[PDB]
């Protein structure tokens, strides 16, 4: 099973109204305009989240009770070749004010991704914990942390180029990752 948790699977990040339960949820919005707002945010509750649950990582986790290990968040920019930009991906571990602006997110574990010929970039969330195992269920004790994204510069397109596009966000486990203690999944239901 842990072999399958190391496989990069697509996160329903943009599962907002009108986007939930259609292919459109996997597509993260990006554009030419310069904001100071988050592109996305994510609680590191990886089986008991709204988005991460029905990933292959989230699924395998929710047949188990306890987990340990580093999470790999891999992002693929799917704009035009001619679109440039620099982004910031962050993992802030928990217990402080959640990173609403870029200067807060910059003070944690972060990477500045330059968009270029290398289409994909990974941000690893290192295993930073008090407890040696965390819950797959949502916890106030074994808290996960906050994943965000910001613009470093802006995405810049030239003449005749698509001003708005997307990225794809994948999640996989790292080879430090392990689960323990079986249970039936809360995802599937059945008629009595």
């Amino acid at each position: 099973m842990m072999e399958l948790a190391e496989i990069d699977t697509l996160i329903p990040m943009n599962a907002v109204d009108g986007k939930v339960n259609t292919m459109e949820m996997y597509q993260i919005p990006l554009n030419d305009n310069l904001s100071k707002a988050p592109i996305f945010c994510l609680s590191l509750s990886p089986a008991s989240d709204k988005r991460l649950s029905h990933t292959m990582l989230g699924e395998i986790l929710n047949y188990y009770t306890h987990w340990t290990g580093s999470i790999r968040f891999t992002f693929l920019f799917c704009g035009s070749m001619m679109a440039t930009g620099k982004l910031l991906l962050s993992y802030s571990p928990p217990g402080a004010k959640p990173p609403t602006n870029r200067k807060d997110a910059m003070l944690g574990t972060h990477i500045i991704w330059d968009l270029g010929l290398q289409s994909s970039c990974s941000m690893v969330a290192p295993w930073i914990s008090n407890t040696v195992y965390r819950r797959c269920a949502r916890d106030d004790f074994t808290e996960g942390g906050f994943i965000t994204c910001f613009y470093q510069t802006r995405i810049v397109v030239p003449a005749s180029t698509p001003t708005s596009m997307f990225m794809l966000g994948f999640v996989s486990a790292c080879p430090d990752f392990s689960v323990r203690l079986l249970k039936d999944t809360p995802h599937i239901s059945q008629s009595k």
Partner: peptide, 12 residues
């Protein structure tokens, strides 16, 4: 419909 409605893409 498996997935839950997210509030904003900026939901933590």
């Amino acid at each position: 419909l498996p997935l839950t409605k997210v509030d904003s893409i900026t939901t933590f």
